[PDB]
mmCIF file of C-alpha atoms in Angstrom:
data_model
loop_
_atom_site.group_PDB
_atom_site.id
_atom_site.type_symbol
_atom_site.label_atom_id
_atom_site.label_comp_id
_atom_site.label_asym_id
_atom_site.label_seq_id
_atom_site.Cartn_x
_atom_site.Cartn_y
_atom_site.Cartn_z
ATOM 1 C CA UNK A 1 -2.847 -27.066 -8.650
ATOM 2 C CA UNK A 2 -3.845 -27.373 -5.098
ATOM 3 C CA UNK A 3 -7.566 -26.738 -5.835
ATOM 4 C CA UNK A 4 -8.521 -24.155 -2.546
ATOM 5 C CA UNK A 5 -11.664 -24.519 -0.521
ATOM 6 C CA UNK A 6 -13.345 -21.789 2.189
ATOM 7 C CA UNK A 7 -15.593 -18.613 2.093
ATOM 8 C CA UNK A 8 -15.270 -14.994 1.808
ATOM 9 C CA UNK A 9 -14.510 -12.649 4.174
ATOM 10 C CA UNK A 10 -12.417 -9.439 3.792
ATOM 11 C CA UNK A 11 -13.397 -6.226 3.001
ATOM 12 C CA UNK A 12 -12.296 -3.515 4.641
ATOM 13 C CA UNK A 13 -14.096 -3.717 8.558
ATOM 14 C CA UNK A 14 -13.185 -1.143 10.709
ATOM 15 C CA UNK A 15 -9.835 -1.329 12.664
ATOM 16 C CA UNK A 16 -8.894 -3.454 15.926
ATOM 17 C CA UNK A 17 -5.927 -1.534 16.923
ATOM 18 C CA UNK A 18 -3.534 1.551 15.773
ATOM 19 C CA UNK A 19 -0.469 0.877 17.235
ATOM 20 C CA UNK A 20 1.027 3.341 19.833
ATOM 21 C CA UNK A 21 4.472 4.827 19.447
ATOM 22 C CA UNK B 1 -4.224 -0.750 -6.315
ATOM 23 C CA UNK B 2 -4.404 -1.062 -2.629
ATOM 24 C CA UNK B 3 -1.413 -1.339 -0.675
ATOM 25 C CA UNK B 4 -2.773 -1.943 3.047
ATOM 26 C CA UNK B 5 -2.582 -5.398 3.481
ATOM 27 C CA UNK B 6 0.576 -4.141 5.569
ATOM 28 C CA UNK B 7 -1.200 -2.282 8.220
ATOM 29 C CA UNK B 8 -4.022 -4.467 7.318
ATOM 30 C CA UNK B 9 -1.556 -7.269 8.016
ATOM 31 C CA UNK B 10 -0.913 -5.261 11.737
ATOM 32 C CA UNK B 11 -4.409 -5.580 12.529
ATOM 33 C CA UNK B 12 -4.551 -9.958 12.161
ATOM 34 C CA UNK B 13 -1.346 -10.296 13.251
ATOM 35 C CA UNK B 14 -2.120 -8.897 16.686
ATOM 36 C CA UNK B 15 -6.173 -9.346 16.353
ATOM 37 C CA UNK B 16 -6.724 -12.784 16.686
ATOM 38 C CA UNK B 17 -4.925 -15.054 13.213
ATOM 39 C CA UNK B 18 -1.331 -13.871 12.915
ATOM 40 C CA UNK B 19 -1.503 -16.871 10.847
ATOM 41 C CA UNK B 20 -4.349 -15.375 8.791
ATOM 42 C CA UNK B 21 -2.243 -11.633 8.744
ATOM 43 C CA UNK B 22 0.581 -13.465 6.625
ATOM 44 C CA UNK B 23 -2.012 -13.998 4.344
ATOM 45 C CA UNK B 24 -2.847 -10.436 3.662
ATOM 46 C CA UNK B 25 0.555 -9.926 3.457
ATOM 47 C CA UNK B 26 0.077 -11.705 -0.104
ATOM 48 C CA UNK B 27 -2.552 -8.469 -0.950
ATOM 49 C CA UNK B 28 0.462 -6.640 -0.774
ATOM 50 C CA UNK B 29 1.290 -7.488 -3.799
ATOM 51 C CA UNK B 30 -1.902 -6.363 -5.431
ATOM 52 C CA UNK B 31 0.335 -3.942 -7.802
ATOM 53 C CA UNK B 32 -1.929 -4.108 -10.341
ATOM 54 C CA UNK B 33 -3.310 -0.862 -10.966
#
């Protein structure tokens, strides 16, 4: 029921981290 | 078909949007081929 409301921004941006062990 | 929200959420879970990272996990459900 709750009608969403926001912009779009989530395709495939380059990754920030990469763990470590 | 795109189960990346896991490793993708791991980012938002420590890149500045954990709460939003929980939203990514929702993409994991993506099982519509």
